[PDB]
């Protein structure tokens, strides 16, 4: 069937900048005819070419096209002028999850269990499609108007068929040891995020990047006594140095055992995005 007439920059009232990346700038714009708000990611063609990012941008547009799930940023359209590329993304009014971590300090058991499960569910879908986020962090986990998660940042993402290092704090050991990236690299990033939800801070913390990596490879981190145990036991089954021994991966017979964990005992996995999120303290 045909498509709706190609959108141009002139069809938008561009507002505040929402975020600034190395290669792009996300701006809040209002579609004039429909009065809808999108998060337009604006990338400069010369700059992408100069910095050899054409596969990065191509991959990003392609992955975002095959994603169709309530926990993921939707790509509504793409257009371009002489200089720039425009990507029409779904707009999350409540911003980063990190914002809410910094705000309330640390999450309670009900809240940690809710957003953790949402993240687990999102990762089950993504991986089900054979895609690795490769940079999953509280900075990439956005919060929409209705307080449900919306994962973004797919430039870094890898689509498997049968190279890159993410944010230091969430980097998996195999990336530092064998330069390797797998579905399980996202399951390490998840364990990190859960520890951040319960403790207020990520598990591997040090002066510079080099020191962080040393802790990661040495598995050097510790749980505060206050940490919920079932939450500790789950983090323990994810921050495993052997990648094939992480809860949620193919070698550990998939996502079933992960969802089956005692920390998700009271979770209705079935309709999470329809569920009313727990008030953040
Ligand atoms: C972190 S700013 C941002 N990035 N983004 C991407 N990359 O899709 C969005 N949809 C937003 C937003 N505020 O809605």
Swiss-Prot record:
Its main location: cytoplasm. Induction: Stimulated by insulin, and the oxidants hydrogen peroxide and peroxovanadate. It is an enzyme of class 2 (transferase). Residues 12-264 form the Protein kinase domain. It is found in: Cytoplasm; Nucleus; Cell membrane; Cell junction, Focal adhesion. The keyword Signal does not apply. GO terms for cellular component: cell projection; cytoplasm; cytoplasmic vesicle; cytosol; focal adhesion; nucleus; plasma membrane; postsynaptic density. Keywords: Acetylation, Activator, ATP-binding, Cell junction, Cell membrane, Cytoplasm, Kinase, Membrane, Nucleotide-binding, Nucleus, Phosphoprotein, Serine/threonine-protein kinase, Transcription, Transcription regulation, Transferase, Ubl conjugation. Coiled coil: none annotated. It catalyses: L-seryl-[protein] + ATP = O-phospho-L-seryl-[protein] + ADP + H(+); L-threonyl-[protein] + ATP = O-phospho-L-threonyl-[protein] + ADP + H(+). Residues 43-87 are annotated as: PIF-pocket. Homodimer in its autoinhibited state. Active as monomer. Interacts with NPRL2, PPARG, PAK1, PTK2B, GRB14, PKN1 (via C-terminus), STRAP and IKKB. Interacts with SGK3 in a phosphorylation-dependent manner. The tyrosine-phosphorylated form interacts with PTPN6. The Ser-163 phosphorylated form interacts with YWHAH and YWHAQ. Binds INSR in response to insulin. Interacts (via PH domain) with SMAD3, SMAD4 and SMAD7. This is 3-phosphoinositide-dependent protein kinase 1. The chain holds residues 71 to 359 of 556 of the full protein.
């Amino acid at each position: 069937p045909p498509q709706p007439r190609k959108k141009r920059p002139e069809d938008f009232k561009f507002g505040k900048i929402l975020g600034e990346g190395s290669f792009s700038t996300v701006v809040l714009a209002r579609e004039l005819a429909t009065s809808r708000e999108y998060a337009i990611k604006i990338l400069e063609k010369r700059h992408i070419i100069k910095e050899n990012k054409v596969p990065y941008v191509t991959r990003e547009r392609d992955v975002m096209s095959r994603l169709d799930h309530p926990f993921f940023v939707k790509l509504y359209f793409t257009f371009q002028d002489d200089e720039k590329l425009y990507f029409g993304l779904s707009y999350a009014k409540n911003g980063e999850l990190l914002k809410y971590i910094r705000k309330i300090g640390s999450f309670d058991e009900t809240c940690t269990r809710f957003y953790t499960a949402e993240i687990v569910s999102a990762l089950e879908y993504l991986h089900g499609k054979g895609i690795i986020h490769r940079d999953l962090k509280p900075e990439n986990i956005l919060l929409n108007e209705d307080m449900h998660i919306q994962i973004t940042d797919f430039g870094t993402a890898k689509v498997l068929s049968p190279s890159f290092v993410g944010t230091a704090q969430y980097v998996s050991p195999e990336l530092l040891t064998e330069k390797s990236a797998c579905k399980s690299s996202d399951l390490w990033a998840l364990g990190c995020i859960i520890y951040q939800l319960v403790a207020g801070l990520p598990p591997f913390r040090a002066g510079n990047e080099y020191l962080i990596f040393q802790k990661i490879i040495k598995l050097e981190y510790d749980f505060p006594e206050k940490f919920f145990p079932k939450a500790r036991d789950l983090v323990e089954k994810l921050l495993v140095l052997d990648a094939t021994k992480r809860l949620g991966c193919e070698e550990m017979e998939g996502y079933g055992p992960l969802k089956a964990h005692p920390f998700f005992e009271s979770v209705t996995w079935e309709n999470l995005h329809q569920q009313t999120p727990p008030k953040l303290t």
